[PDB]
Symmetry: C2
Subunit: 388 residues, 2 copies
């Protein structure tokens, strides 16, 4: 029934970015070795390309599962973890209980403090591939295997890649006319500030639209609160990532001193990360990123949200569509799911990279139909992947 | 004058000697074909060879600094991080303000959640190399660059690698007679349990000996409190790692419900990790590991401990002697320093792998003389290093 894992193969898929992105670099920033650039304003490194890490996992019987995680930065890190260490402890196991395999792999390195970061990125890719196999072997979609899920849910527009405030609103209105009712903007994009941006968006989109602000971490708690106050006359849906990730005291302060819902969680890895915040802060929404987390982690974060009446609105990002499909599968089973980030500019071009009916239209994701993940890399994608 | 960094070279060094496991290999334990072994107790993975990652960093003027981090598992992860991402951001910088460079590197990935693990392992190795250069350029030891430190301080015996209770007591006494006054044992080891072990050690060593219990993580807070209460009559020096690292609520419960000092922190990476625990828990002792952390992080943790009256008792782990030399340099400056882990099997490799006069004799560490770290790899070590 469940055939042992025979092989674990790691790949990268690297392609040119197809969105204007270098407009964010306004301070004379220079490309560093291997194509990296640091934005001076937030000190964060960015790739000059799109890249993710893909895993092909094959049973003795020939069932092929796929997983994926972040590969934008030093994909050799995940590749080393899998090739040197983790693959050996997956091979010979089977997919009868994927979460048991995850928990064993996690346990190998937890006491040495590798409880997140690249280690969990690696585990995420293996976990998605193993659940894909489990579903295929059962003849069930992952969501079915997880107890049942819905086949569609709301999607919000993320990413307004235009140079001017005016053109950003025109882009949002274009998406509104396509049947989207929920939107998010990033505060560093906003030249006259987040208040002027939300003011424009609110005017353009009308009072019924949901308009969230991604505050993108780089504030003191006091400044975060000031900016949230400036935005609040325009009815923000939520304020996301008001302070640095490490600053739980600062998040606590922000969350207890505004009524604007606070959303966090894209950069977490496990429910343990969630526990550290919700035990201290007022968190309205969690925003898990499947590519960092894997299905086992995502399901446990979802269950913890249900315990505390916290809404779940998952993140989305640069990737081939494999971890996104995983996100949809897992998200669909969650009682606290309100909807899901939609990166139109990433999703649209990568239809070519996938076999499988995953769609997003008229403000809703439509889940794929097949057993397991329901998607796989297309023949075109297989021509592009490189071994790592 | 501080000359800009020209080159960053990454190596592994695999040792011809092997530190004992604490806990004899047991029926059913498997040597994986990948060269790793998972232990039946905590399900932590262990290597079959001791190995660390070394970094040689060279200025344009030709000053050579050395750093070191963990390499026991998947050293390709750190190597990829350094070769692909980090080295390019260090090249061109100088050692005038090593902590500024550390901060810039850390900031590149913090919003994506890479705030620890292998990322900070890699930063630790670079940070140690940069301080080594800074010292040599100033003609000052690292401790003198940091405002001055002691030239020696007490070491304690951090574990007792023998296969019986009786033999571990005899080994403790052997070290007591050779100048040691403080000892630690691992609670899962004795067949009769940790109360039986501490009772034996107390009887063998006498009232004056400090005897700590390393609880090795795998307890509920309730079970940890039960075991601590059983050991309590025998005057434990501290109870280390009573619950899982991620279980901050569990650590709070333990620390608030025993008067036995609680010690944690070898598997942390930054002062952020400390802040998350000390805000909620009663921590008596922090135990930073230089190989995971680097000088910048280690000193910040020391300063935070000083602010809160928390004792600092650093960890030690097998390596070539580079991160250990860094540990002694940084520890020597700390007002809260109350000792430092030692084991014969951990220290001994550095006698052949390092040139320099770092020592441990009669139960005390003695710091090397000379600028920077005051040590560098020996001809033997330069022979054995392999590029990665
Ligand atoms: Na997010
Ligand atoms: Na320790």
């Amino acid at each position: 029934m469940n055939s042992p894992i025979a092989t674990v193969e790691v790949f990268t898929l690297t392609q040119p970015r197809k969105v204007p992105y270098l407009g964010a670099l306004r301070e004379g920033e220079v490309v560093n070795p291997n194509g990296y650039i640091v934005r001076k304003g937030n000190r964060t490194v960015y790739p000059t390309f799109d890249r993710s890490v893909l895993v092909r996992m094959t049973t003795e019987a020939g069932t092929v599962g796929w997983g994926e995680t972040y590969g934008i930065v030093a994909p050799g890190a995940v590749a080393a973890l899998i090739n040197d260490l983790l693959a050996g402890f997956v091979i010979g196991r089977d997919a009868s209980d994927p979460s048991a395999v995850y928990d064993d792999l996690y346990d190998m390195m937890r006491v040495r403090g590798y409880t997140g970061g690249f280690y969990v990125d690696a585990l995420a890719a293996l976990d998605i591939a193993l659940w894909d196999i489990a579903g295929q072997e059962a003849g069930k979609s992952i969501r079915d295997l997880l107890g049942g899920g819905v086949d569609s849910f709301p999607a919000y527009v993320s990413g307004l890649p235009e140079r001017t405030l005016k053109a950003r609103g025109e882009l949002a209105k274009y998406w509104q006319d396509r049947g989207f009712n929920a939107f998010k903007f990033a505060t560093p994009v906003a030249d006259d500030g987040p208040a002027a941006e939300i003011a424009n968006l609110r005017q353009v989109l009308g009072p019924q639209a949901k308009i969230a602000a991604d505050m993108h971490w780089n504030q003191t708690p006091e400044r975060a609160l000031e900016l949230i106050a400036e935005m609040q006359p325009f009815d923000p849906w939520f304020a996301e990532a008001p302070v640095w990730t490490e600053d739980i005291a600062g998040l606590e302060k922000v969350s207890k001193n505004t009524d604007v819902p606070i959303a966090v969680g894209e950069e977490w890895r496990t429910h343990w990360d969630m526990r550290a915040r919700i035990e201290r802060c007022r968190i309205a929404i969690v925003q898990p990123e499947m590519g960092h987390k894997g299905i086992t982690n995502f399901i446990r974060i979802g269950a913890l949200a249900a315990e505390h009446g916290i809404d779940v609105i998952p993140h989305a990002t640069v990737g081939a569509g494999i971890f996104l499909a995983a996100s949809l599968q897992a998200s669909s089973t969650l009682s606290m799911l309100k909807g899901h980030e939609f990166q139109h500019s990433i999703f649209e071009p990568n239809r070519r990279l996938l076999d499988g009916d995953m769609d997003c239209r008229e403000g809703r994701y439509h889940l794929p139909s097949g057993p397991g993940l329901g998607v796989r890399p297309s023949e075109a994608a297989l021509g592009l992947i490189e071994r790592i």
